[PDB]
Design a protein around this ligand. Structure first.
Ligand SMILES: Nc1ncnc2c1ncn2[C@@H]1O[C@H](COP(=O)(O)OP(=O)(O)OP(=O)(O)O)[C@@H](O)[C@H]1O
Ligand SMILES: Nc1ncnc2c1ncn2[C@@H]1O[C@H](COP(=O)(O)OP(=O)(O)OP(=O)(O)O)[C@@H](O)[C@H]1O
Ligand SMILES: Nc1ncnc2c1ncn2[C@@H]1O[C@H](COP(=O)(O)OP(=O)(O)O)[C@@H](O)[C@H]1O
Ligand SMILES: [Mg+2]
Lengths: 158, 229, 69, 219, 142, 239, 100, 100, 41, 240, 70, 51
């Protein structure tokens, strides 16, 4: 039946599971099909936000282009803000990391200090804050300490 | 003492303009839907009153005719009332003559013949309403449509009123032959939701069912319980 | 966002009607809504202010004739 | 905005010429007064008096209105069946009065170019004001006073501007009180509601057909 | 703002009235002094008497002070601020007199009734009349 | 063309045929009626189109019933037809219910009859307005007027015809509440003589009728002596 | 008519019963009146008198007064002009014509 | 009375105490349309502010600004606002606007 | 035109990503917009 | 969206867009009277208030009225053409009497409104007769449904109401009544007549006097339809 | 619906020159000057290669109906 | 196909009356026989009875 609203969600779940099994070639196929189906709903208020986050992970996973990943994560934050606390904080963590891998650690300061993000200040934001400062100082010793002290959110996210 | 000449006449290209305009008026009416399940029929409409002052329960659109037949409409309300009255009278006449409830098809034929009279008679205009008749006779559900022209068709699922083409496409995509009455109710409500432009509530819409027990208009509580999904 | 506004004001109640107001009567609503505040020398706009603004900006027409449906 | 002559070769102001008016507007000022005494009109006795006391008397007895503090009425519309004596009173009132009698018409203020109609209305009232007490007669007012009309896909507003300029010139942003307006019409149903106010043409006279004695004097 | 033609001066009517209400309150008729005043001002409000409205408005505030009717003071402060828009400056004077009350009275309930005056002005029925009065008033809470 | 039948509405919501019918009555001679404590008095300005008509010809005052009068203005044919209808209604009411028809009931019935002619294209609105007057001890003096539109209202004083506005203005100075029919007859004569226009109308004859306690509840033409006295009073007034 | 260009749309209308009385005083003030000139009478009989026939009522009243060689305006003259203006108003076309 | 107070809220108030509206955050309205039946107080009200106030007040017939030349009609409007822009606190009272 | 609206829009969809090659997804996502999303009205 | 073809604007036939122009024009005709009526329903009462303009002192105030009594327990206010209103009132009384004679119990208000709506439909369907340019608002008390308010228009729509108005100021009074009803209950006491008078004064900005409005009341305690006199109206007005 | 406002924004966050015109500005009294004025806008927009040309209210310059006598 | 579906104004089409003028000349009174005409229309059931 022409019920595409739940098709994208179930298809997104299939996209995530393949990633858990670590089969990127098949994970891409699932996400692509979800994207095509998702382009038939005028008001998917949250699936659009969750679809964009999933697209970001696959982009980052392929290690293809980190500039595009930041764009996808930006939409995830915009649709996730003020409406879904439990999963919105995940966007900030990936947002901040997306900038660090760009060899532009300075921008991480601006995103956290912005008025749009101060509402979401927490241990996670300081988790990437220490690593972001570590890169700017360009010191490996700072990074290691910034990893073990905040290890709960460094070597635990899949 | 009454015009004796028909106000509906054949246009040069062979169409009856008055009937086409009546169909346009119907298309301008409120949405309505009817789904024929495997163990009953369902009829649904919308009742967005212009303001809160209007009494929702004062007047009804899903009106019963007999113990096993009910109908709904989309168009001009007063014409629907006149047709409802005539249909009830015809059903009672049939019952008196034959001592058996009027079959849905027979009532459809009689009501349609009533409609045709107004597209040929003198000094009258076609009824600006299309009906959806539901009933349960001979151990099988029945769903019918009757247009101003007097033509009646048998439907497994249909929708009238505004955005009825989109609703029919929706039904064609979503209908299944082996449905049950509850799934039919859910599908009808969803179809109404496609073109509603507002928040749907118990008082905003009307639902009617027809099963082996007979025809009955659902109470607001049951409509709300179905509306949970 | 740039206006003062008060807590008791709920925007959802106002963007709920079937009226078609595009982009200017939306600004006119806010423009006149705040305009009312200066009438009693107030620097907040209360829900009582917006209500008096919508009825003088959208001015819904009698288009209906409920006997058609 | 004044008109000034200038040397042809070395431009330099030499004189201030008198204000100029459109040649059309100057040709509508009557110089040969018509000869039609009030005794020539029959039956219209209650209406001839009502006009002489609103367009002629307020022009010779200003000491009387100012004694009682009542602004004289502005305008006199004359309506009725096709032929009843509308233009006879106007022509007659142009004979028993020693004042300028600017004689307008109906179709005449209508001109093809944009804004040419307004010129002949502003110029037709400035000229009367520029002269002594004047009466400006607008006969056949239907041509320039048809009811305003909303429409898309073509229409007619060129003539409407001329009427809109007549409306404001008669009474708008200026309390002109020396030019008296007399209008003649045989179809009042078609007139714009704006042209039948009280500030504009005020004394709306009804001219009825002769009953049974006016036909005796009329002959 | 609007200058009404001078016909009757309403100051005299209250002049011999306000002190009379004081005697009734002193005996212990706290209620009887209260409800009588409001009807007095309502007539002035229709006439929109700046001086008349202001003088009477404080009296009820002033009377409740000596009456030690703290519970009846707060309820009386609200009822006098949203009846018929009052007179814009009329409420302005009332808060001033009430403003000096908080600064002088000790003990806990000052804060309990302190917020009551904060909300009476809050940010509605505010500005040059009762604007600066709010600023100090929140400073006292500070 | 929206004013060719009574069954078509104007786009602004008017029935133009009824307006034209109203205009028809406005072109007729005025006929006033005044209600007093004792009863009601009716006067009609009868224009003498020519000296060849017998005095009393084309009478515009009718007796629909022995206790109800009738003064008409407009097309006289329709006025006579409606007088016949009122007579029929009164007779039927007396036969069925057994007592004289109340004036309000008769006015309502005749108005509804007039209204029934303002709905169909098969018939045209009546071109006539008229007023009914009656007196009874139980009910007291009453006066009603019915227009082509079928509107029935009770009046203390009413005028129908050309000079309705002037007659109404002159009636307003009569303080008719606390006067008797004797003074009202003279006042009616004076009002009719004031409203009459000598320049337009050549000559006219005054027709009067009354119903009250003085007449024992019977509608009848005023005695010639009282008519002459009232006429003389009217002449004296216009000095 | 879009908000932003012509934001506020005042709707000056025909005067109400209270306003109608207020209108008369202004234009009927400077008149050599005599007697208990009653402004209450004129208002009830003037329904729809927009803003000038009310001033026409005053000016027309003087016209009746000026006839009979009177430097003398009375209440009857004022009333005699209220109907003469109302009669000359039936030939208008009373239409609202509001924006949309 | 209410109409005048409403009209003065978009002509006088924004041009004397602009700091009030900078508080709330609204920008005072620009235009104003005075419509109604033909004969109420519209031009009288406009002339009232013309006689009062202490700001430049352009009065235009709204139909004397159109001429037969190709572009002169438009140029008269560019100058009208150009003069208004040059001379601050200015009010442009375009009269009957069904013409242009 | 609904066909020469998938090729062109396919290129546009390859631009929002900042790519230099048109892929299979871009064409497939193009038909969703021109046809699938624009089917109604 | 105003296309015409033939006699769409002269007789009750469908316009190309499916509009009955004659019915719409009839709706326009109910405003010609210039009157306005407001009806509001409470917990145990139903009230009507309508203007009462006596243009000249000559009219007898008793006769100029727009409140009528169909039966002992039913009352109506008519807005529109007076003759049509009286005809419809007579029809309603006849129908009520016939119902009582046949079925043996008093007319429910809804049934009477439905019957009048059916007659109006018959008028709008045949081209021989024009729709009546009038609108009636009935009140009454139901045994198992409480107070009732119903309104049938020339088209044939008879939907019930909690608060309603008909006339020139229908829209403004409707907005006022919507605000009041949404506020707490749309009046919940026999002083609901206060709500109706306040609404009428708000829309008409009149500040009425006793001899300017007429009130009709049906209460559960005393279901008989009543027409409040000048004294009671003055008392209510002074209370407000 | 917010047409000019978007253009007001583009002229702000733009790294290329912006040229604003009004449709009615292109028709002037001096015959034969309009074509020169329209031509100068495009010429001037070419010298500064990155530029945006806005012709607001184009309804006054481009209309189907054209009566070739006035 | 989406406007002027019902009656009111409109009527005919000044892309259809063109050939009726043009085709009436290329069928006889025309010397140079090298000119040929064409239409594109979405409907062939709405063409006039002459074409
Ligand atoms: N409230 C009022 N007070 C005094 N005079 C008034 C009032 N309302 C209207 N008038 C009268 O109206 C007359 C004309 O008013 P004005 O020309 O402003 O109205 P208008 O016809 O609506 O205007 P316009 O046609 O110019 O738009 C004035 O001479 C004045 O006497
Ligand atoms: N989404 C929006 N956000 C903020 N303001 C808006 C929005 N939509 C419209 N507006 C308001 O609309 C007003 C007018 O908009 P703009 O100047 O862009 O004109 P426009 O709508 O394009 O006009 P026109 O189509 O008549 O040329 C602006 O003052 C702006 O505040
Ligand atoms: N009362 C009258 N006495 C004499 N002639 C009259 C009278 N009324 C009209 N006429 C004649 O009518 C002619 C003028 O017609 P007029 O009334 O001006 O036409 P309109 O009414 O269309 O302007 C004159 O020739 C005049 O002889
Ligand atoms: Mg005007």
């Amino acid at each position: 039946m022409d019920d595409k609203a739940l098709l994208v969600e179930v298809q997104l779940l299939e996209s995530k599971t393949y990633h858990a099994l670590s089969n990127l070639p098949k994970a891409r196929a699932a996400l692509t099909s979800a994207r095509t189906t998702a382009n038939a709903i005028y008001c998917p208020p949250k699936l659009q936000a969750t679809l964009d986050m999933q697209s970001g992970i696959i982009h980052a996973a392929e290690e293809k282009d980190w500039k595009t990943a930041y764009s996808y994560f930006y939409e995830a934050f915009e649709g996730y803000d003020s409406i879904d606390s439990p999963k919105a904080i995940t966007s900030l963590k990936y947002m901040l990391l997306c900038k660090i891998m760009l060899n532009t650690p300075e921008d991480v300061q601006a995103l956290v200090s912005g008025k749009l993000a101060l509402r979401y200040a927490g241990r996670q934001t300081e988790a990437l804050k220490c690593v972001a400062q570590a890169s700017k100082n360009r010191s490996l010793a700072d990074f290691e300490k910034a990893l073990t002290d905040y290890r709960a959110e460094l070597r635990d996210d899949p | 003492r009454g015009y004796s000449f028909s106000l509906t006449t054949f246009s040069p290209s062979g169409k009856l303009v008055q009937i086409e305009y009546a169909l346009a008026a119907v298309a301008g009416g409120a949405p309505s839907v009817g789904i024929k399940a495997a163990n009953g029929v369902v009829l649904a409409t919308e009742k967005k009153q212009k303001s809160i002052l209007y009494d929702e329960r004062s007047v009804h659109k899903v009106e019963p005719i007999t113990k096993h037949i009910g109908l709904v409409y989309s168009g001009m309300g007063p014409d629907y009332r006149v047709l409802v009255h005539r249909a009830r009278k015809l059903a009672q006449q049939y019952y008196l003559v034959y001592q058996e409830p009027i079959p849905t098809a027979q009532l459809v034929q009689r009501v349609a013949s009533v409609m045709q009279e107004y597209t040929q008679s003198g000094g009258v205009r076609p009824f600006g309403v299309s009906l959806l008749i539901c009933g349960w006779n001979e151990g099988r559900p029945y769903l019918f449509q009757s247009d101003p022209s007097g033509a009646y068709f048998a439907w497994k699922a249909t929708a009238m009123g505004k955005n009825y083409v989109n609703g029919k496409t929706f039904l064609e995509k979503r209908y299944n032959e082996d449905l049950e009455l509850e799934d039919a109710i859910h599908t009808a409500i969803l179809t109404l939701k496609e073109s509603f432009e507002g928040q749907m509530t118990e008082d905003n819409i009307e639902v009617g069912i027809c099963n082996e027990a007979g025809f009955r208009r659902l109470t607001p509580t049951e409509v709300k319980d179905y509306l949970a999904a | 966002s740039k206006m003062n506004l008060s807590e008791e004001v709920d925007l959802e109640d106002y963007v709920a009607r079937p009226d078609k107001i595009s982009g200017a009567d939306i600004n006119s609503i806010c423009q006149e809504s705040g305009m009312l505040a200066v009438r009693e020398n107030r620097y907040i706009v209360l829900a009582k202010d917006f209500e008096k603004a919508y009825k003088t900006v959208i001015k819904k027409d009698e288009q209906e004739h409920e006997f058609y449906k | 905005g004044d008109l000034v002559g200038v040397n042809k070769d070395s431009y330099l102001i030499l004189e201030t010429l008198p204000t100029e008016y459109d040649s059309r507007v100057k040709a509508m000022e009557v110089d040969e007064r018509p000869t039609e005494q009030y005794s020539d009109i029959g039956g219209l006795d209650k209406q001839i008096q009502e006009l002489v006391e609103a367009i002629v008397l307020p022009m010779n007895h200003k000491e009387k209105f100012e004694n009682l503090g009542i602004q004289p009425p502005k305008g006199v519309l004359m309506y009725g069946p096709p032929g009843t004596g509308k233009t006879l009173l106007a022509r007659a009132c142009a004979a028993q009065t020693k004042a300028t009698f600017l004689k307008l018409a109906g179709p005449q203020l209508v001109q093809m170019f944009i804004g040419d109609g307004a010129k002949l209305v502003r110029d037709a009232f400035a000229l009367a004001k520029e002269k002594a007490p004047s009466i400006i007669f607008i006969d056949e007012l239907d041509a320039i006073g048809t009811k305003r009309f909303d429409s898309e896909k073509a229409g007619d507003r060129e003539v409407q501007r001329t009427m809109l300029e007549l409306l404001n010139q008669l009474d708008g942003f200026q309390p002109n009180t020396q030019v008296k307006v007399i209008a003649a019409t045989n179809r009042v149903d078609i007139l714009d509601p704006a042209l039948l106010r009280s500030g504009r043409l005020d004394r709306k006279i009804e001219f009825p057909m002769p009953n049974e004695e006016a036909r005796a004097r009329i002959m | 703002g609007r200058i009404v033609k001078m016909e009757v001066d309403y100051s005299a009517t209250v002049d011999q009235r306000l002190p009379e209400c004081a005697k009734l309150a002193k005996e212990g008729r706290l209620q009887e002094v209260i409800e009588t005043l409001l009807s007095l001002e309502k007539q002035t409000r229709t006439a929109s008497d700046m001086v008349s409205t202001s003088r009477i408005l404080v009296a009820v505030v002033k009377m409740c002070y000596e009456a030690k009717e703290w519970d009846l003071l707060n309820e009386n402060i609200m009822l006098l601020s949203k009846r018929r828009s009052q007179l814009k400056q009329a409420v302005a004077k009332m808060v001033q007199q009430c403003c000096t009350y908080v600064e002088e009275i000790t003990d806990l309930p000052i804060k309990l009734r302190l917020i009551d005056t904060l909300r009476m002005v809050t940010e509605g029925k505010i500005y040059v009349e009762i604007e600066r009065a709010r600023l100090t008033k929140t400073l006292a809470t500070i | 063309g929206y004013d060719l039948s009574a069954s078509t509405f104007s786009p602004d919501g008017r029935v133009f045929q009824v307006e034209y019918a109203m205009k028809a009555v406005e072109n007729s001679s005025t006929a006033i009626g005044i209600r007093c404590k004792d009863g009601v008095v009716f006067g009609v300005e009868k224009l003498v189109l020519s000296k060849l008509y017998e005095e009393g010809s084309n009478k515009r005052l009718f007796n629909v019933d022995r206790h109800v009068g009738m003064a008409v203005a407009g097309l006289l044919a329709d006025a006579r037809s409606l007088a016949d209808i009122a007579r029929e209604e009164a007779s039927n009411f007396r036969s069925n219910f057994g007592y004289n028809i109340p004036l309000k009931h008769l006015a309502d019935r005749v108005a509804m009859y007039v209204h029934a002619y303002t709905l169909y294209s098969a018939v045209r609105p009546f071109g006539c307005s008229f007023m009914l007057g009656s007196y009874s001890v139980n009910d007291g003096a009453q006066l009603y007027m019915i227009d082509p539109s079928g509107v029935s209202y009770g009046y203390w004083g009413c005028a129908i015809g050309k000079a309705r506005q002037a007659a109404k203005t002159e009636i307003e100075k009569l303080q008719m509440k606390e006067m008797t029919c004797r003074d009202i007859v003279k006042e009616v004569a004076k009002i009719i003589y004031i409203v009459h226009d000598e320049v337009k109308d050549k000559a006219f004859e005054l027709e009067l009728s009354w119903v009250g306690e003085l007449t024992n509840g019977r509608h009848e033409i005023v005695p010639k002596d009282i008519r002459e006295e009232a006429e003389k009073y009217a002449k004296e007034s216009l000095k | 008519l879009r908000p932003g260009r012509l934001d506020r749309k005042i709707h000056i209308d025909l005067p109400n019963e209270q306003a109608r009385l207020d209108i008369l005083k202004i234009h009927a003030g400077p008149i050599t009146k005599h007697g208990e000139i009653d402004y209450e009478a004129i208002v009830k009989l003037s329904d729809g008198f927009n803003g000038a026939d009310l001033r026409n009522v005053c000016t027309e009243a003087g016209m009746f007064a000026i006839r009979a060689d009177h430097d003398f305006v009375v209440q009857e003259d004022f009333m005699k002009a209220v109907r003469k203006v109302a009669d000359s108003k039936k030939l208008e076309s009373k239409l609202d014509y509001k924006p949309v | 009375s209410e109409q005048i107070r409403e009209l003065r809220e978009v002509i006088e108030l924004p041009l004397t105490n602009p700091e009030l509206f900078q508080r709330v955050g609204i920008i005072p309205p620009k235009g104003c349309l005075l419509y109604g039946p033909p004969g109420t107080g519209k031009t009288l009200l406009a002339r009232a502010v013309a006689s009062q106030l202490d700001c430049n007040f352009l009065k235009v017939v709204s139909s004397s600004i159109v001429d037969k030349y190709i572009g002169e009609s438009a140029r008269l409007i560019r100058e009208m606002f150009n003069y208004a822009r040059d001379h601050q606190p200015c009010i442009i009272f375009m009269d009957e606007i069904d013409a242009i | 035109a609904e066909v020469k609206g998938v090729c062109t829009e396919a290129g546009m969809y390859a631009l929002r990503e900042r790519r230099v090659h048109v892929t299979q997804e871009d064409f497939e996502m193009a038909v969703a917009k021109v046809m699938q999303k624009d089917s109604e009205k | 969206r105003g296309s015409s073809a033939g006699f769409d604007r002269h007789i009750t036939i469908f316009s190309p867009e499916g509009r009955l122009y004659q019915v719409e024009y009839a709706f326009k005709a109910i405003n010609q009277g210039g009157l306005t009526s407001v009806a509001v329903r409470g917990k145990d009462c139903a009230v009507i208030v309508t203007q009462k303009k006596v243009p000249d002192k000559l009219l007898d105030s008793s006769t100029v009225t727009h409140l009528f009594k169909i039966t002992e327990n039913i009352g109506c206010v008519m807005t529109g053409m007076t003759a049509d209103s009286r005809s419809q009132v007579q029809r309603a009384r006849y129908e009520a009497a016939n119902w009582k004679y046949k079925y043996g119990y008093e007319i429910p208000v809804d049934m009477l409104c439905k019957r009048i709506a059916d007659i109006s439909q018959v008028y709008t369907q045949n081209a021989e007769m024009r729709p009546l340019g009038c609108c009636m608002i009935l009140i009454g008390i139901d045994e198992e449904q409480g107070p009732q308010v119903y309104k049938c228009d020339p088209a044939g729509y008879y939907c019930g109401f909690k608060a309603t108005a008909a006339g020139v100021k229908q829209t403004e009074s409707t907005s006022f009544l919507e605000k009041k009803v949404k506020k707490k209950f749309d009046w919940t006491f026999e002083q609901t007549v206060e709500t109706a008078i306040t609404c009428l004064s708000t829309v008409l900005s009149i500040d009425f006097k006793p001899s300017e409005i007429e009130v009709g009341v049906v209460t559960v305690e005393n279901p008989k339809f009543r027409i409040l006199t000048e004294a009671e109206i003055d008392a209510h007005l002074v209370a407000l | 619906c917010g047409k000019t406002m978007l253009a007001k924004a583009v002229a702000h966050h733009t790294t290329a020159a912006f040229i604003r015109v009004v449709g009615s500005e292109f028709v002037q009294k001096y015959l034969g000057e309009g074509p020169r004025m329209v031509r100068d806008v495009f010429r001037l927009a070419k010298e500064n290669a990155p530029a945006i040309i806005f012709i607001d209210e184009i309804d006054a310059i481009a209309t189907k109906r054209f009566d070739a006598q006035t | 196909g989406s406007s002027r579906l019902e009656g009111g104004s409109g009527g005919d089409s000044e892309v259809q009356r063109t050939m009726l003028e043009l085709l009436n000349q290329l069928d006889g009174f025309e010397a140079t026989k090298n000119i040929k005409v064409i239409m594109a229309t979405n409907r062939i059931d709405i063409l006039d009875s002459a074409l």
